[PDB]
């Protein structure tokens, strides 16, 4: 069971949570980089996991994660659960099966989440207080779809993107250690936007060279061409999407 509590959370407790999540998600290594399982050879009973996000012993939610892409597909508050509009059809057969399950009106893509939130990722604060507020909001069952979408933008980045990217888990750690919320910087956004592209480059690489180049953005909004296994930014990957075997 994978739990994270916001009560007295520390840099270390958050790090240990992300480490446990990464260990459960890893399906193998490719070029020494962890990769998620190939969905075509994965047994469906092994496809979905839960994380408990708690503010106290009496206030908590669960989030359901698809191990094939580390993406949040649903959440649960008590006897009621809510699935992203684009959740795989099998998710509701394995996650929160003892609840009344509902479909959310928005997809889990940032495009649709930002549309419903009326805010972009860059405008939405991340950190312990944002997560605490989101846990409370989901547990309360409030019907405000704008805030549901905003809350998922927070959770997705602090859980799923953090699991995928060492840069992001470390930035959340720093926020917790300092007690200072943050808005995702241009490098964080570009990592989120290019996870599948970086995963593909690594896995398709020949002689360490990507067939399909990947253009990232650094903190100073500078465009960076990543076309090699040895590029420094490749080291930021903690979990890759499965694309192909070498």
TrEMBL record:
SUPFAM superfamilies, A to Z: Ribosome inactivating proteins (RIP)
> Does Ligase appear among the keywords?
no
Matches recorded under PROSITE patterns: SHIGA_RICIN
Q: Which GO terms describe its biological process?
A: defense response; negative regulation of translation
Under catalytic activity, the entry for this protein gives: Endohydrolysis of the N-glycosidic bond at one specific adenosine on the 28S rRNA
Molecular function GO terms recorded: carbohydrate binding; rRNA N-glycosylase activity; toxin activity
Could you tell me the keywords of this UniProt record?
Answer: Disulfide bond, Hydrolase, Lectin, Plant defense, Protein synthesis inhibitor, Repeat, Toxin
From the Swiss-Prot or TrEMBL record, give the protein name. Abrin A-chain
Q: Which organism is it from?
A: Abrus precatorius (Indian licorice)
Taxonomic lineage of the native organism:
Eukaryota, Viridiplantae, Streptophyta, Embryophyta, Tracheophyta
